[PDB]
Amino acid sequence: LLSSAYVDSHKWEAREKEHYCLADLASLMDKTFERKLPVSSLTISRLIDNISSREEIDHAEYYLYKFRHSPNCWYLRNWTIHTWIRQCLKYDAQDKALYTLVNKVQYGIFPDNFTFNLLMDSFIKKENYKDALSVVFEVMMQEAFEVPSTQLLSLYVLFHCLAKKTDFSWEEERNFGASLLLPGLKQKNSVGFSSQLYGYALLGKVELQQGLRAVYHNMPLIWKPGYLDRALQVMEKVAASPEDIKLCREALDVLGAVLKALTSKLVEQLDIEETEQSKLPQYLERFKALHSKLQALGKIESEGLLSLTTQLVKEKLSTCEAEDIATYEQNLQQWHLDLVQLIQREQQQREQAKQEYQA
Amino acid sequence: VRPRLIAELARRVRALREQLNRPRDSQLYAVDYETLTRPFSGRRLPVRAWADVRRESRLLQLLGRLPLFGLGRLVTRKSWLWQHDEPCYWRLTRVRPDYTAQNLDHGKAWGILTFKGKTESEAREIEHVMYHDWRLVPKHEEEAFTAFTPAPEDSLASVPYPPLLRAMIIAERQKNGDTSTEEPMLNVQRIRMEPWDYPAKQEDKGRAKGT
Amino acid sequence: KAYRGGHLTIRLALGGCTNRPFYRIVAAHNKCPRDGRFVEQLGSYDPLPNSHGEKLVALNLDRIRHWIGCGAHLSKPMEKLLGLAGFFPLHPMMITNAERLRRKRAREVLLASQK
């Protein structure tokens, strides 16, 4: 989906790099670590810059792990994470990039939106939608849907994967619901509202069958009950929206199926408050009334979610890509300035230390 | 006085060995979830915490999964959410992870506190970081979570004196010739009652000694 | 004698003989023994009713105020005594115990009525 200009690596490969052998830097990190001393962010940056083979990716993974488990783990710079992902893509090691991304706790890989897009798009080009979905879920876990390009790509991948999925688990319900709610809330169009409705339906099914803690625990989701209520509020908002905004028939069908299936440990809620299981029949009545209202107002779209997301992508991804490329070049310039500052600083300490030593 | 130098030598050696053999957070605040005992000491946790220890997350169990260890994010607590209806949370400013932890799920944190909707001026160290009581506010929920309208906090401005003490105040007043009929009265405006669960100063708190 | 930390507290030191208690209200370091060294004796409390059916409590109120203003804490029985004297508000636990006794006696009366 992303153009060649977006995924082009020429500008990254044109960055200024100090050439080192990875063996030498690895040995210096090894000594610093056995002495229980801190390692600089510059040292790991140099090590990740100088990966030159597929085995050097394996070694750089290990040294990323050790830097994460060192006193200066917080100082891992963003250009280093971007370069790590670039190297993994360059030497045919997308599996290693994905492994470090899913185990981000152990390796500290927290990509920016451009780097998520690069990885997700590589997987899409190789038609590896399972791994692309894994990258989508990692985007959701990090709440990195601030850039419209990421939102559009994630929605495309999610709807593609959902079109061909029948046997369907509750952890998968939770993940898909969160991954469709987060980008959906940021899109003020039919895709966004349909995604909101579908994701709320899935999360409400999870809440009703498995409990609310199964929804919010270790997720970027709220701990308040009423996800099905929120789906119905999406329907009500669409009923009062401009002409352009509509709702896909497929999302409505999913919500109806969830309600029809639902109506056929510590207590976290106050005993004065009404439970959701005791509100399901009113949810049915509201769903039917609102479905009739939307059908009367002609606010039901017949195009599938995947096709309609496809046209939305074809309509907006180019502009989003242009914006992302501009920001990316700005980031490269700033990263270059910061790296030269770090190099100057360490050269200064080495010179001062030698001056002290000659005394 | 015969000098006692062995005592001084022992004190200095003990101090040096304690500041070189410091136990880390990953060791001190680890917990065996099956028995709910600290492996470092073997002491069992109190009963009223058991369920939470099996259900809730420590603060850095949340922060280790976030870029920059979640600086600037809002973190609330389950106990606050149950106890109070007004928003209570910390806005993080500085995090010092315990690198020795396998999952980087131990360490210290600093931030600005909002308790029952009232925000503090300065950022201070956060207490109970090692408790299994912490929740992370989603980014898309913060606007809804932080919303708070300060209600009129008009409490009693003054209270009567205790009977005998009031009687003595009045009797002394009459003895000194003053004939005022105004009741003796205790000002309680400057005595602000802090809730018992308000965060305390983590900087003043101690630490378990290695052994 | 230097204690590690500690503070002054106004409390009851027990004297008298077996089956005949008597109390001296004293201000003392909290770490000191119950009947040991004290800073000043601030009163007395005879818990046994006398020939007039009275429990006699003497309170050196000037010195009690002085020691409270010097940073002295109070033991819970001393707070309850000062509440009974009207010097302090009635302690919450006295009110709660009174309510509990009221409920227990109401239950007993209801048992009598039921029988």
């Binding site: 106050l270 | 106890q83 | 006696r105």
Partner: peptide, 30 residues
């Protein structure tokens, strides 16, 4: 107390609750 505070306490002390006591007798029972 308000019913909401009582429900909050009943949630806080799940499984370790005793029978809720109403207002006490106004006077000392005889």
């Amino acid at each position: 107390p308000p019913e909401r505070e009582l429900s909050r306490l009943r949630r806080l002390y799940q499984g370790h609750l005793q029978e809720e006591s109403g207002p006490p007798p106004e006077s000392m029972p005889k």
